[PDB]
Design a binder for this molecule. Structure first.
Ligand SMILES: CN(C)Cc1c[nH]c2ccc(OCc3ccccc3)cc12
Lengths: 126, 128, 128, 126
């Protein structure tokens, strides 16, 4: 059982998450500038108040390049539910030394975006 | 700064009943806490949202706060107030849990809420 | 002998594999104890001859089995195996559940798969 | 189906082949139990193209007992390119519950040995 190192973004709108070029990577003080590159993956949630199934707001979780459920996807690969982000000067190499989080040992880092970042309409952290 | 929060994620109600747990159950599991500390209250949070152009009432959410902490930190166990329901396990202490306090959401993530062994939640409630 | 899940299958009508948040996803079984609430879903894929005469896959079915029972009775909880996903209810014992075992359809109907109130499912799956 | 070691490789830059003392050599995996700390390293030499053929430094990959390209080998099995290792407290049972890694959805774990572990000469975790 693995997990993102960070908490999620919640989507309230109808369109997929998308950051402008050069933003989107959560702050992690234990990472280096080389490490600042990854993807957000959508997690869908469904529940049962009597209209059978109700789709809740999707959530989007960040994973460093080369880790997570899509560890094998190269940066920029087109896949539904996957969107790519990177900071200027980050290296296009797998971040196996960071890997993913095991919740039995570490709670998620509160997701925080760098000063001046623009979240698209409808998206909120926590 | 100046951000207070429940230590746990919310129980959302899509049914019509207020939250209620049979006496002895209903406090979420917190591996960083003792059985003395298993006492507190859920508190109701209302919300609206915008479908579009429609002042759309949303599903109530309930948040757990340990006894003596949170928005009703001053209220004693069992005090009657609309939007507040009480919960505790057997053998928990009727003492304020100031050492646990509330969560700083900038500093710590919420604990996803899970009722302990053999605890069901009323119809129309779900964790998220 | 040869046996069956105690429960009817969950069919995957979406691209997403079956998954549940920790604590969630064990089928409701009034004949069962909170100690027993631990197991796995196993994907069963069927092929069929299509109208063009080529084999083609049907929608995958996911069958629940209590821990220590069924086709993967040898696996400990959390084992890594394609087509196997794990579920456990808060406070279930990580012990093999050989006392409840698997079903003989000769003398036992399957229990209609029902998930506890407030269970979050992935898209493509439906909770009756 | 086609899988990979859970860990990055040990590269043999020298002429010593792997060998650890009693109870040493199992990589640090916090998603495993004292029961599981048992398995083998398997050599993987690669060949590269002045226009002749060329060996590179052999890469040793760790596979838990019961898993990998030699999953049907019991502990202590004698085979060229196979070295065996176990921690005190481990079980001599196939660890199919760990299995091997699909790189599509899991990054490699950087191979790390516990403090005090002794390595032969010429061996490095790149
Ligand atoms: C939150 N967890 C602690 C749940 C967990 C309990 N017992 C496990 C055994 C294996 C596992 O994941 C398999 C695995 C992971 C990394 C490397 C090899 C194999 C996960 C778990």
């Amino acid at each position: 059982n693995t997990a993102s190192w960070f908490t999620a973004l919640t989507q309230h709108g109808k369109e997929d998450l998308k950051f402008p070029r050069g933003q989107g990577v959560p702050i992690n003080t234990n990472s280096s500038p080389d490490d600042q590159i990854g993807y957000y993956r959508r997690a869908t949630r469904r529940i049962r108040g009597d209209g059978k199934m109700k789709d809740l707001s999707p959530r989007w979780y960040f994973y460093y390049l080369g880790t997570g459920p899509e560890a094998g996807l190269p940066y920029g690969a087109n896949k539904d539910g996957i969107i790519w982000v990177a900071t200027e000067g980050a290296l296009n190499t797998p971040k196996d030394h960071i890997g993913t989080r095991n919740p039995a040992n570490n709670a998620a880092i509160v997701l925080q975006l760098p000063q001046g970042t623009t979240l698209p309409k409808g998206f909120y952290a926590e």
